[PDB]
Amino acid sequence: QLFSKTPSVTVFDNRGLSVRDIAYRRHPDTPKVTEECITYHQFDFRGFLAQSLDPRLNHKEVTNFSYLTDLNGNIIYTQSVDAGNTLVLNDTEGRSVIAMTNISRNGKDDLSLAVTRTFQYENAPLPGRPLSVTEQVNGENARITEHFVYAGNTPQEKNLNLAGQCVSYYDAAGLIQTDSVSLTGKPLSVSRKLLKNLDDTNILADWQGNDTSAWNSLLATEIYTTVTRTDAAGAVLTTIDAVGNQQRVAFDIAGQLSASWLTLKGGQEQVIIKVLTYSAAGQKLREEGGNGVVTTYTYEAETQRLIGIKTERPNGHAAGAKVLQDLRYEYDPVGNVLSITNDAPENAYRYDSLYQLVSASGREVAGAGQQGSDLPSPLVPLPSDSSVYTNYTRTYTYDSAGNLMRIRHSAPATNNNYTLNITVSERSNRGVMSSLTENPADVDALFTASGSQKCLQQGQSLIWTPRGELRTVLLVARGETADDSESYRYDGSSQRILKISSQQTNHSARVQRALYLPGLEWRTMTGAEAENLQVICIGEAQVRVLHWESGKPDGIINDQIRWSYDNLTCSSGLEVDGDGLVISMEEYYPYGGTAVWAARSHIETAYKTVRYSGKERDATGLYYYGFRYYQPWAGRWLSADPAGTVDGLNLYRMVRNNPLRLTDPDGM
Amino acid sequence: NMVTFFKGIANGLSENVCLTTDDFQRQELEGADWWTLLSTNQVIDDMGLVLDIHPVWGKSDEEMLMEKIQSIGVSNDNNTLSIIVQILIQAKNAQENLLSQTISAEYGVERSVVPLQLRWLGSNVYSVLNQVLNNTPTDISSIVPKLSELTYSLLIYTQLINSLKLNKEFIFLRLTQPNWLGLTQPKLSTQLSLPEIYLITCYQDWVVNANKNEDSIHEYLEFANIKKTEAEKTLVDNSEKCAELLAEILAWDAGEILKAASLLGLNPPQATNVFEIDWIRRLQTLSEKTMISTEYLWQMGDLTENSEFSLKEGVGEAVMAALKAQGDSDNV
Amino acid sequence: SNSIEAKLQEDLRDALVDYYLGQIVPNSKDFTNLRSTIKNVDDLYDHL
């Protein structure tokens, strides 16, 4: 095959370190040229890499990195033209001491933008463990972003197995009072308390001075503790989100999951499974949830390349024999997909020799329009029609370096053809769809000294913060009104513990506040009549469930349970009730634009936000991927992470661009 | 592209750069308006803009702004003068920085050296602002190509300087001291010829290869060049002192160097132009090759000239002496 | 190495040799009658 003679090579100095990258890359439809897909790598007299480049900068003769090091030669203070000069600094004993980034490009660069965090520790006799850390505003005030209050060794602390342990991680978003632990070292309870008002966007969550005798002003009434009991196997015996949600699980003779039963807040606990069958690889095979459908999955047993999946309501079901789907899938030697189809009409794909995707033709639903920063309406009810998902072609294009060019498309069924084109920096990964700016050198002015974007999707309000975190935003609004804005709390582990959005100006004043906790999302859309409702981690990958405290639905029960098809990409593309009828079916390009979006009923729109990639949508259409975030109109991160250096040069390098090249989306 | 330059510069000039009568009738500024005085003794434009003088190592920012007023003295008060210097320096800083921020940094321009980039174009910030107002050409039609030619020559200068990884002091002292270079010509800015380029080469080469700091070299060049030309000629003393200093810089015999100057007929002996040091250095390279008496190394030129034998046999024996002594140093 | 120049002296041998054959043979006021001596080695004995 013409794919032959595309090898990768590595070439070394006499020290024995690879002085360049080598591949042999060909665009298949113009096969005469194989690219100079090779690049510089340079290492010091200590054998440690000083430099590497985009080849496209090499004849431009401008450097891309800096590294600075100690005796023992570890990196200290270091820069790239995308990441910016950045520091984390550590003890002799490697304990962290301080962290800084967001420093300008003249060389006299301005550390008054250092965004500082610094760390504080035990003293003798105690071993020197971190009792605390503080933010410092660069050039300004420090505030104690957390404490890690280590226990003593009282008989109490023995009992609780908290001997010496952090009984109180006073923290961003409040306190977790770790307050019992097992002989198996597993925790057994911890009082997660929020802030005195967690939807207060500006109370510190910083823990200055003597002790919580002060910070009682700052910790919540929301004493939303968790409690736990454990097997000797360490698997969960039970666990209880002390607001009233709880869980139990059981396993086979070896240890695979056999059943689980999960109490929704103060309710009964009920089993999720009706029938179960795994593969011997422990992967699934033939399952029936409380949904009561036969679903089955079929794969290359050597590799679990799923050749297909079938679902029906079985013969003799409460709603009789009814096939619901029958998907089939096709794969290459290394295992890249090439096509998929289903019945109850086909789609197909192409890649560079690099496996860099280039084509993704298929079928997509009429009337959805050309993709914007939106989710359309679903087709409702679910079309039985053979055609409304009309056939189409879509394609991808990419830089010599790790950057996209364009997505290019035809909708011949409707002549709705168009192309998307990206403007990108002369000198960095800074770049966006050309209607934001067409200028590939103006475009680089638009990003922070930490390479996050200065302003939102089309210039809307945004602030980035310590832990790097974006923390307030104006997703969309009228006349610059704040009543359509959004903001977050997260803990020091960046657990996105609370949403607080407004969408209420001349509107239903149901303040779009939602908590997130162990086992729990608590949407609290307060004040029209407050729509206050919990949803629980029925899994994680999850079945899903709902409970109104207020703002009850029409025609719909509280505590209703539904299963969903987190597919080969975890993409939750279909949702089904306890009776084997589909609520909704939806699908999306690799670019994450929707191919299809449909439901059997209309207000079901309100009930589903975790979707493509299996990830949560943020409100506009972009996904909360899970620490970073994904924009589908651009088909990109809307978020840099220069920590991707471990795996690629581009701060916004999305994935190995056939995304199915890789397994598991954490969304950082 | 050019329109976006004129965009920021045309508005910001009128906004902030226009220095005013009240700026020179401030609470401390009693009596005659320094604004008028400098709008008479030309230092401030009728648009209030600073008449930006080119930087040179002969002086400094405040030294220049001080002399600017002290050379005539519309006010004798050191206080008023000094604070007015503070005022005009903040104004000039804003003026110059604004022009730096406005110039398409996308040109690959380091904003920090924009005024000296201008001075290599001969031009200055003030004349830039003058042309900026002459059309406020934030439009494609009013931008005359004479203006864009500057950016073009900047494309040249920048691709060069970006390969150089230049230091501002280099260009500063360069334009300050072409008399220290091999050339001092009217429009080098455009002639941009090989001699200049080789001067750059050997200059940067010496910089990286030298044993000591760049300013220690500038000190050598002051103590040799300016010192020799203090009077018509003035520097018998620093023959040895410069030779030893350069020996510290390059690790070779000061005496040998002095003799090299002697056979070059350079009086006073101090080799003090970049090309002179480079030649000397080439002599050192020849020494690093063969360690022969540079007297003879130079005498070797006559060998090509035949026409006589005694010198030939002499230097021939000299080559044998080199063979034995240096070979022995290569082998023992 | 001195070996480099160590050729020169053989050249000098050749020079002497020719100075014998070329100059001495016709210009020898000594040995003006006697000839033979066609080969270098000869005078190594005869007078050298």
Curated annotation (Swiss-Prot), chain A:
Keyword Secreted: yes
Deleted gene: phenotype: A double yenC1-yenC2 deletion is no longer pathogenic in C.zealandica larvae.
RHS repeats: 163-177, 292-306, 324-338, 345-358, 391-405, 483-497, 558-572, 584-598, 618-632
Keywords recorded for this protein, A-Z: Autocatalytic cleavage, Repeat, Secreted, Virulence
Domain of life: Bacteria
Consequence recorded when altering R628A: Loss of auto-proteolytic activity
Any one Gene Ontology cellular component term annotated for this protein: extracellular region
Localisation per UniProt entry: Secreted
Span list, region RHS-repeat associated core domain: 588-668
Result after altering D641N: Loss of auto-proteolytic activity
Regulation: Toxin complex is secreted when grown at 25 degrees Celsius or less; at higher temperatures the proteins are present intracellularly but not secreted.
TM helices/strands, residue ranges: none
Free-text domain note: Residues 610-690 form a beta-strand plug which closes one end of the shell; the other end of the shell is closed by the 5-bladed beta-propeller domain in YenB.
Biological function: Part of an orally active toxin complex (TC) with strong insecticidal effects on larvae of the Coleoptera Costelytra zealandica, Acrossidius tasmania and Adoryphorus couloni and some Lepidoptera larvae. The TC has an endochitinase activity.
UniProt subunit comment: Semipurified toxin complex consists of at least YenA1-YenA2-YenB-YenC1-YenC2-Chi1-Chi2. YenB and the N-terminus of YenC2 form a large hollow shell of beta-strands. The shell is closed at both ends, within which the C-terminus of YenC2 is probably found. The C-terminal region dissociates from the YenB-YenC2 complex at pH 4.5 but not 7.5. The Yen-TC:K9 subcomplex is about 26 nm tall and 22 nm in diameter with 5-fold symmetry and 5 copies of YenA1, YenA2, Chi1 and Chi2; the chitinase subunits may be solvent accessible on the exterior the complex.
Record-stated family: Belongs to the RHS family.
Name the UniProt record assigns to this protein: Toxin subunit YenC2
Species of provenance: Yersinia entomophaga
Taxonomic lineage from the root: Bacteria, Pseudomonadati, Pseudomonadota, Gammaproteobacteria, Enterobacterales
Gene encoding the protein: yenC2
Curated annotation (Swiss-Prot), chain B:
Domain of life: Bacteria
Compartments where located: Secreted
Disruption phenotype: Cells with a disrupted yenA1-yenA2-chi2-yenB-yenC1-yenC2 locus are no longer pathogenic in C.zealandica larvae.
Entry function: Part of an orally active toxin complex (TC) with strong insecticidal effects on larvae of the Coleoptera Costelytra zealandica, Acrossidius tasmania and Adoryphorus couloni and some Lepidoptera larvae. The TC has an endochitinase activity.
UniProt subunit comment: Semipurified toxin complex consists of at least YenA1, YenA2, YenB, YenC1, YenC2, Chi1 and Chi2. The Yen-TC:K9 subcomplex is about 26 nm tall and 22 nm in diameter with 5-fold symmetry and 5 copies of YenA1, YenA2, Chi1 and Chi2; the chitinase subunits may be solvent accessible on the exterior the complex. The Yen-TC:K9 subcomplex has no insecticidal activity. The native complex with additional YenB, YenC1 and YenC2 subunits is 16 nm taller and is insecticidal; the toxicity-conferring subunits are present at about 1 copy each.
Identification of the protein by name: Toxin subunit YenA1
Species per Swiss-Prot/TrEMBL record: Yersinia entomophaga
Gene from which this protein is expressed: yenA1
Region of the whole protein represented: 833 to 1164 of 1164
UniProtKB/Swiss-Prot annotation, chain C:
PTM annotation: The isolated toxin complex includes 3 peptides starting between residues 768 and 778 of this protein, which might be physiologically relevant.
Description of the deletion phenotype: Cells with a disrupted yenA1-yenA2-chi2-yenB-yenC1-yenC2 locus are no longer pathogenic in C.zealandica larvae.
Cell compartments where the protein resides: Secreted
Subunit structure, interactors included: Semipurified toxin complex consists of at least YenA1-YenA2-YenB-YenC1-YenC2-Chi1-Chi2. The Yen-TC:K9 subcomplex is about 26 nm tall and 22 nm in diameter with 5-fold symmetry and 5 copies of YenA1, YenA2, Chi1 and Chi2; the chitinase subunits may be solvent accessible on the exterior the complex. The Yen-TC:K9 subcomplex has no insecticidal activity. The native complex with additional YenB, YenC1 and YenC2 subunits is 16 nm taller and is insecticidal; the toxicity-conferring subunits are present at about 1 copy each.
Function description: Part of an orally active toxin complex (TC) with strong insecticidal effects on larvae of the Coleoptera Costelytra zealandica, Acrossidius tasmania and Adoryphorus couloni and some Lepidoptera larvae. The TC has an endochitinase activity.
Protein name: Toxin subunit YenA2
Record organism: Yersinia entomophaga
Organism phylogeny: Bacteria, Pseudomonadati, Pseudomonadota, Gammaproteobacteria, Enterobacterales
